[PDB]
Design a protein around this nucleic acid. Sequence first.
DNA 1: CCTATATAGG
DNA 2: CCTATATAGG
Length: 66
Amino acid sequence: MVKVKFKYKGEEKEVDTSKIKKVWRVGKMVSFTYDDNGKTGRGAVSEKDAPKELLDMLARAEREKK
DNA sequence: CCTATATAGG
DNA sequence: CCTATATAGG
């Protein structure tokens, strides 16, 4: 399935897009929270590095709560 | 380095 | 209030 590779405390981490709870933009940074094994995890990626699915959840987050 | 940015999180 | 993320440079 689709995955997003992001940094976390100096290391590359990966998470399935299906686990993402909320995604939002901060300029060129795309931040998000995810269900992390029962607790909330966080991550962010550069907009250029975001996978399509994440950018769609983004557009549908704000470009779909207008 | 720092401050700011959006957001969530007992 | 603090922290974590990418980027700006206000």
